[PDB]
Every structure is written in structure tokens, then in C-alpha cells.
DNA sequence: GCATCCGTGACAAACCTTCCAGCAAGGGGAAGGTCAAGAAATTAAT
């Protein structure tokens, strides 16, 4: 919980590069919030590097997520 | 018990899994479509 309290700067900072308009800021803020929570499981802080740097790659990755799954009515796959 | 603040009308980029259609070059099963045999039903001799 105060792992991701830390850093919602990190994905509001983010979310500034994919403010199109299929979505609104929210709904891609808190797809940000469980990647990030994915990325606290899967951070394996042993090898010497940084939260935010590794977070950035499966933050952006549930963003392109969202952008692909929501922001169409026709719902075209992600790839 | 009185002045004052909101609704509401306005002809990125790779990485890996399953699932399904195509072209070989066609055969076969299931399901539905047409031809030659004998049997019903009519008539011309008493």
C-alpha cells in the first residue's frame, strides 16, 4: 500500500503521453495503479535498480492495454 | 424569519500460448435430388 501510494506521481506522470481521446485520465491512471502493483510482485529489487525504472515498462504496457482493449467501440485485439 | 448560491427552461517493442482458414490433390459419409421395372384405374367385346 505505500509502495503504490509513493508513486501515483509515477503514473500521473506517465499519463501524459497517451491523453488522446478514447479514454479519460482516470480510467488510464488505475490501469497504471495495477500494473504498477504487478510490477511491486514482479520487481525482484535484488539486482540493484530502481522502482520507477522498471515500472515505467509494465506501466506503459498496461496503458497500451487499455488504449487497445477500451478507446474503440469495435474492439480490435492488441496486437 | 430574510439575503444569497446552484439546477433548468430557452417556437512502444518485442516475446510466448491457443484457435481457425487455405492449398495442395483429393476420398468418403450424410442428406438430399432424378431414370426404367412392375402394380392401381379406365374402356370396348358380349
Known sequence: KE???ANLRLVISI???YTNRGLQFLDLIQE???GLMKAV???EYRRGY???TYATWW???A???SIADQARTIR???H
Open 41 to 43: 510482485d514482479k520487481f
Open 59 to 61: 506501466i506503459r504496457q
Open 15 to 17: 499519463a501524459k503521453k
Open 63 to 65: 496503458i497500451t492495454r
Open 32 to 34: 497504471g495503479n495495477i
Open 76 to 78: 480490435i485485439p492488441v
Open 3 to 5: 509502495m503504490v501510494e
Open 50 to 52: 530502481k522502482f520507477s
